[model samples]
Target chain A: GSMSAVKVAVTGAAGQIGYALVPLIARGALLGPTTPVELRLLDIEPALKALAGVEAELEDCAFPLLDKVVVTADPRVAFDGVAIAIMCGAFPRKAGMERKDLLEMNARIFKEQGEAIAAVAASDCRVVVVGNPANTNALILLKSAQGKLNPRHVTAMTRLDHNRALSLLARKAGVPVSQVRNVIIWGNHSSTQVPDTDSAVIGTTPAREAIKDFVQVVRGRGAEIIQLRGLSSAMSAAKAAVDHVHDWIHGTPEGVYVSMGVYSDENPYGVPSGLIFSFPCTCHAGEWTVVSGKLNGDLGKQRLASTIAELQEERAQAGL
Target chain B: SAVKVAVTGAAGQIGYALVPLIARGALLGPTTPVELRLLDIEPALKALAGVEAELEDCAFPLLDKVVVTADPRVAFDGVAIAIMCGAFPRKAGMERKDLLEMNARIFKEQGEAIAAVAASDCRVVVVGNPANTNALILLKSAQGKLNPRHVTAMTRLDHNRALSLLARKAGVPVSQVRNVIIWGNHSSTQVPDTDSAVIGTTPADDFVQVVRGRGAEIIQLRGLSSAMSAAKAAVDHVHDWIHGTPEGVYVSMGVYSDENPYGVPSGLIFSFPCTCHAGEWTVVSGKLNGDLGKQRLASTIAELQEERAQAGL
Candidate 1:
């Protein structure tokens, strides 16, 4: 009955993304700085050593907010008592591999994870998929968790794309990212994802009027980072995931529209239910709802539908 | 004004683990703004640039700015906190004397450069190897230019190591372990004194042995030396050094000798348990009295003397 630590589970807890991700979580970035958390780190057999090293790092942090750290190779043990699970364990597709192959790989992983979470996770546990093919993977988890987890509680991460859109928009508008608000990433988290700013405002001005090339910059941002750095963005990707979960559990401030990839069962903007799609969401009391009625007619609808089309094609390929 | 923090070796593993923590406001609270200056060797400029790209991608609200450079003068200019993680890493077949002599020149030049351009109140925390003696060289070289007390090395890693290991051995939480101190040079000869350490008012025994060899144990198991933990301890060290230690607890650090009351020779930088208050660390003297404690202290002091002589300091 005393102050108990929140049980949180993170998969792929020793990769490049997790390297940045784990410390931020330990340092109280997911929960507030004062809230205690017991971390359950999960990884595969090969990554077990890397996972132990992360545990050592967490122990070395001597974090007051860190109540305990438990590393596990099995999904059930990792998900036991977990209230928030961040799934980042799927392997990225090799170049020239068919999209179907990658989707099947993730389908297997998320299916196992989802069943584990369903069997052992706390009833209130919320899941966020951060690995590639996030949308369909989350959809798989949602279907697999069925009655054990609420569809609304299962989500994927598009906050990375959302953050990229905001930063690129701010840069084009000649303002800080903080000055930009309501920037949305609609549809899939892929390149076909829509960076919609129809309702976004930069310093009291609409983002569309403020920045002419915001969409192009954000759409190309991931590739641009790869071109310049010779690596895809892990740090930023981890940051967005952290912020996504943080804002989801702890509501965003009034009138601020944060982005998230939620189960498309609610079908805001008519995104198909078969895919977990990104939407402009405002969270309150640990629930996020689509900020409706912001779309300006045909072009906005067309752009949103374009990304949903990509998701639909991938969903069909996965035989979902 | 934003704190101008300079971190050398900003592209290395520890620095890579470190800089983000500082930029995200671990040094101060999460709100204190920071102007981060990341410095590295000229060859690592591209790596530093990659790090810079990541920092930008974090979109940290409190990070005011980030500047990358290879120039020590530019890196240290107006810097209030200089974290020196860059050093000549020991290589295969490298004699200890040769290693010390080589690092002496680097620290000497850096110290002079720090004195020339760093803020008058700049505090340095050396994170590289031979940390205690390297800190001594830097302090001696910066004489009259910076306060000797403001320059220290990292023994906090050892301090926390002792705490963690003792807690593990005693089957208690680390929070229950108190007063564990790592005294002297940060080498294998360093003394992890667990004599006064207790696990919830019960004396912890045979735990110093575990603390002293924890690094080797980690290396044997993981095939990699400790980087994240070391960086984290460095963070905790600098944070507590500035923010003050909590009541009823003391931590360790490698501080310049302001004539410590211990019988060890004066002017040798040594590790001691300290209580920090308002950004100043006061050494906890009069604790090393027992025979075993005295013998342990002397062994580390002997190592410091020999290393000091080799570097001609």
Candidate 2:
């Protein structure tokens, strides 16, 4: 009872990603096993019922590390006193909708959440946007913060894209996933996400030649699962959410440079300011320092530039 | 891999929560690699495929193999640890007789399959509702094939709630709490005894009410039933059963009782405070003192007796 349990808020707590993500968080994937966490689950009013089910399941797990759970519809209340927030809820893209329209719809939610984060979240609160158009959604969140929270505190999830690239390359190279590192996902969390394998090594062999059809496999992998499983990768996304935060909290694995979608000042690596871009990052003392200045061959540089262009276009379309 | 562990009802809500823990080495310790065999009914087999895919994505180093099936023979084949979580849930306004019969039919088949195909040293723990009696049915169905010691019902969920509640009331972490017990059936009639429970040398009394009332408290808050805690307790039950409880720490487990200090009749599955060591359980013997203790035991025992009679055991 005397323990200062860390509080975490997860938006869209009743959705597919939230459903899988909360259990992993409660089981000590977010912070390590010894640190007790209290979950604040946020969703719309209609989803409160389903979110209550998740809360009950957490109680039933009787996870010793799980201190408590709070379910709410108010973003302010959910984010209040929270040290970490996983933004999984968004206005999903519907068929026949324009890209800008989807961005506007999602931005409204993130805008409100960003204000909530500013008003009530912990001073050191870290946020990760897992919803679609994540890079842009993350931009809107930072913009709406009104300077209470640092831009560095807000990041988007390209970790799933990163994992897809890692797993695919490892499978192709016939090495374990543990042996693969520095695989970068350098743009949006979509088809435009560039999985850079130039600096990536599989058990010390450069992945550029080790992997065959890496770009095609990583880009089309979402659709491949959608065709077979009828959903766009919930569990894999949840695992990536875990890995992303795990490295954030527990320190990134030694000698392994991971990928994180962080707000870049645009001056780094020729990417323009004000856009959230996936960059090769390493965590030390709870900070994500982008692994800048790494040499990229002409092909790798072109791919990175292409994704940056896509992010720039997305920013322009969003009128940011 | 030390053994192949098969989980029944391997595609349900609890299964969704339970399988991840198992894959992470909650049941078997971290060093042990496990071959998982997941069994469900035919209609849910599609969903099981999705769960299988999820497990693959986890990329757990300790998970050696995974097999999903609808056939009990295939599931139980070469299995050393069988956790029976599959059963028909009690429906609103449904007759108790119908519920028991539906579950009886399922457990009977699984019991026979375990007898027919499971490893000779297989240990079975029934986690389905009406678990105590359901376990009794499975034991009877597999009478000639298994030692009664190997068949037990799940009471560790209720036991865990007792530990947590006691810890809360004592203003201590659950790790510091000890010796609370869940006696009798794992139903509402069960007794959560805190008479000798200790929290840092302080006796924990008046704690039984909270453990017994915790389920209603959760239901009022969530409007849903418990799954994660039940799944968690299942992991604890099997872990302790195999790995042994630590010295001087007595936990609760539901096992087929023959004779004990408490005058509950023999040949019924009873939840008793016990310590497991060297892969064996020694029931902590004590008198059922106080009128309250006697009343609670009698009520649960009567329920078991009626269930046994209804099943024509």
Candidate 3:
């Protein structure tokens, strides 16, 4: 009961995802219920007023697990001695902007953030990137950190895509999502990403045999939600971010595997080293190990190759 | 104990912002498990299913079960806590009478269903618009099967807004501000009184008009209404109701005004400073002093009376 509060930092702390994410974190979602948290919210100077409003609301909540909150525009101040950093800020791709322009814009932002984390964050800080172009953005942050942050500890989010796949497959198989197991999200966190159903088991039935065109449905689910809700999927995205961090810090259940975007250096299954790729993983004791031997068949190779090429293009476009 | 909590309008924006908080142990504390009952209209069932899917994906450890339905009777079955969020929202160019009549029908049926099936000690908080009048209608529709004292309208949002505003004015943290009262209705006509507030060893200053318009200010800045704050306030309301407030501290709630404790008219749901203990709220007495407080209280009470008349109660 007397444990020290964990310092957690969130970028884009005034945006849609941040508004949804902060309350969840304050209520002991990221860490379990007993761990007190001190949130460090980082956003641009222009959004400080709105961030202050968000901070006021957070105070209004009177969350018992929330010890304190610090709102700032400086990455160094936000990241100082933090144990967990959720990098949720990046330049979104607007109309008429080229992919190269988006990459360049976010690259500069993550680079500065990576340098700040390297300088002031805790030695064991675990960073999870939730911004767009997540895989490549994570690679840029890792490279910019200059090896001060561990490659294994710095990852991106693919859990939203993973959870989307689970839900879609469950609907198709007529089973609950909890009964679905081992569905892997391969490669990027974008449209070209692969939702691998070949290794998925839906209550002991192979997911490939259980559903058709499942990949297309899972890939387009985000846009479908936007079309229906008339807004982006902020709540689900925030929930997935919490899921990613929670499973990473605590442990996944025995005989269960989830998805994460992890650094791939000298990895098996033909994914290039130095790229952040989505893979099926099992976590225990605060460490994640990518589950292997699932990407061995011919169709798996084909799906992996397409997404891998897309991630490579993104990496080069980011000037990594 | 595993508590069963129900949320209405489970597919709407505030419901989407709120259900996760309840499932993640914000409404009930960390140790108590909760089973959620989600209700929406039949047309919104698909979207409600989407929300249910998201909750399943979250895999909250304390969430024991989830049931999504369209029928009020089924949703309210055995529920220990019910948060009423579905209402006929006032449309542009709509008459106040039309809005009240529309919501009265909805709340009447829901209140009847709750009386028939919910737990005997079920606590209900109405979060929909025209909340005070809606709560009054629901209690009357209960026909004595439910306790009027157990049903409340949410003014905790305005209560918290007043606290935040006073804390800002005093240049102190919000936790230091205590006992700011929100009176009357939940609309712009509501009164935020800080006459009884103590801010870090100093009495709070006079009331400002900021609390009444804070919702609009939030929308102007964020391009959305204060859904997150509203949800948090609802959570705070229910949490304090069950877990009790600190000693010598009081929060505001819109509860039944049956006994004329504050000189307000009876048979109205009005906001007042309240202290909670043992799963009940006692309206704090002897704090409604000061000339300004009296003036504002009377003004808000008149507005609520007009709303009640408009509601045909």
Candidate 4:
């Protein structure tokens, strides 16, 4: 009971993102500064030395907020007692890296992590996939965790895109970043993830109205940060992931909307009625209340159907 | 304000000596949260970096704040206290005048930066080399921007080592000893005044003989320093100053320049065992008696005149 308080399982906790994320998590991000975070840091053996250094930093800060720091080389150690699990530890496709290489490599690791997470995590566990081909990876985790983990609890991170869209438009509008809210990341969590600005509003006018060519800019922010920072979008990705899970477990504040992929039965588009797809969800009491999204016509519907079908094919390809 | 203080240069050879003293409450004693401020330049940055990485390894709960930065402004700014430690050390056979001339120019730039951006209440303690004179350069460069009382150069390391050696010889605890102060200088001329002894009412005469000769004894054993021991003294002086001096008396520390007795030049900071209160310094100003006292004060006066003459003061 003493140790289990706020158990946050961080996959790739010894990787680059983990290097940034692990300290932030142990220090309590949006869990409030006082919340004691018990970090379940999971990574391969090679990254342990890096994690050891980060562990050293944690001690040096002597953050009164930290309860425990558990560094592990296995998934179970990362998942045990974790109420929130962030699947951020994935290999980014290197410059010469191929698409097939990315998919093939991630499928094996994600499958193993998914099954292990399902076996060890608590009933109320909320999973957020931060890896590439994220919708598909999330689908793989859902299928692997099925008959064990609940459906609505599994999610993938697109909040970063939502934030990027807001920030880009806010810059154009010359408004505060908070003025732009409910910006939707509709299709996937990758470049294919459609950031719908139509449903995004700032004082009843669509936030898209304020910008000229901001659509592609918001979508390209991640790639640009990766290009600039010489690493995967780590610090920003960490901030976005914290915002997403914190908003989900405790519902978004009144009059606010969050963009997340949740399992749904109603085919608002041709998303096969019940699979994980992006929606403008407002979660409360451990359930998602998905209001209106931007899937209004045939083009929007087709994008949804095509992306969901791609996920379905990938899920079946994994023998789900 | 209660955040765990962070110190840079956490692992330089300087830190090896500083960390244990700080952890054990050297100047602040048991109640203080003495967050060290360790600064180093480029070559020492790696050692500082490695030390920073190691500090994380220690996971000290008392350490309340630590942020390592490359920018001098960032390193010293907002720091309640500043200790300049990253100067290029003197090579073998480097003359004191040459070292002082070179270091003074570097410290002038740093002193200006600290004056410009450091917290309005920043106190500086210089420990690189030619420390007292370097302190004079900083105090001159800082002008009136910093509190005159806060800027100090450490002679306490020598003072402390002398006391510890005395304690060891007497087979008594170091805490039982007091009133041991360094008079006049921070170098060979620095006289350790311990006429008033607390080791016992009658005192240990053999202990006094051994303590005064500790530098030679340690030189016999280690072959080199009192440098690591000197660095330790630097931290304890600032640690005690920001935290507090003991109720009965204070140890010797050098600030910019001051007026009055001892025949030491008025403007240059010299060592005195005085009382500090409310973030200001007051020389102990005690009455001296007998030949033993006159001999110690007179010897120190001769050393100070030589230093003053060398500087053309």
Q: What is the DockQ of each candidate?
A: 0.45, 0.31, 0.31, 0.05
Write candidate 1's Cα lDDT for A11-98 as tens digits: 9887777777887887788998878899999989887877887787677666667788999889999999899998888887789877
On a 0 to 100 scale, what is the lDDT of residue A143 in model 2?
Answer: 88
lDDT of 2 by residue, A54-129 (tens): 7756655557788778999999899999999999998678888877778878878988999999999999999999
Q: Candidate 1, residue A282: CA error in Å? A: 1.3
Between prediction 1 and prediction 3, which has the larger DockQ?
1
Residue-wise C-alpha lDDT for candidate 4, range A1-320, written one tens digit per residue: 45435878888775555654554565455466557677788878777755555553443233445566787778877798678888877777867765546766687777888788888988788898887667667777887765687877888887777767766556567655556677777766655667777676776677757765565876676655545333445545665777788788778877778888777567455467545677888878756777764577777677666566665665565556
Runs of candidate 4 exceeding 4 Å displacement:
A1-4, A203-212, A273-275, A303-306, A309-313, A316-320, B1-143, B146-313
Give a tens-digit lDDT track for model 3, residues B1-313.
5699999988887898899889878887878889899999999887877777667656555776789999999999999999998888677899998999888899999989999999999999999988999988888889799988899999998888787777767877666888988888999888777778998777873455678777777777666667887898888899999899999899988899998466788889998889998679999988866565567677778888888878777
TM-score of each model, paired residue for residue: 0.94, 0.88, 0.82, 0.57
Candidate 4 DockQ category? Answer: incorrect
| Candidate 2 residue spans exceeding 4 A from truth | A1-3, A45-57, A91-99, A165-182, A196-202, A205-235, A266-269, A292-296, B89-93, B167-176, B205-223, B246-248, B290-295
> Can you write out model 1's per-residue Cα lDDT over B1-313, one digit (the tens) per residue?
8899999888888887888788778887766889899998998887788888777767676777789999989999999999999998889999999999999998998899999999998999999988999998888888679898999999988888777777777777777788888889998888888777878878765566677777776676467778777888888889989899988678989988667867677778889888998778998877787665567787888899898888879
Which parts of model 1 have CA positions greater than 4 angstroms off?
Answer: A172-176, A202-213, A227-230, B198-206, B290-292
10 residues in a row with least lDDT, candidate 4 chain A? A55-64
Second chain TM-score, each model: 0.96, 0.95, 0.96, 0.80
lDDT of 3 by residue, A1-320 (tens): 55888999999898888988998898788997778899999999998888887876786665667777899999999999999999889866787887667888888889899999999999999999999878888999999989899999999999998988876677677665667777889888988888877788876777767665777887887777766555667788898999899899999977778889999886767678889999889999888998888876676677688788888898999887
- The better candidate by lDDT, 2 or 3, is 3
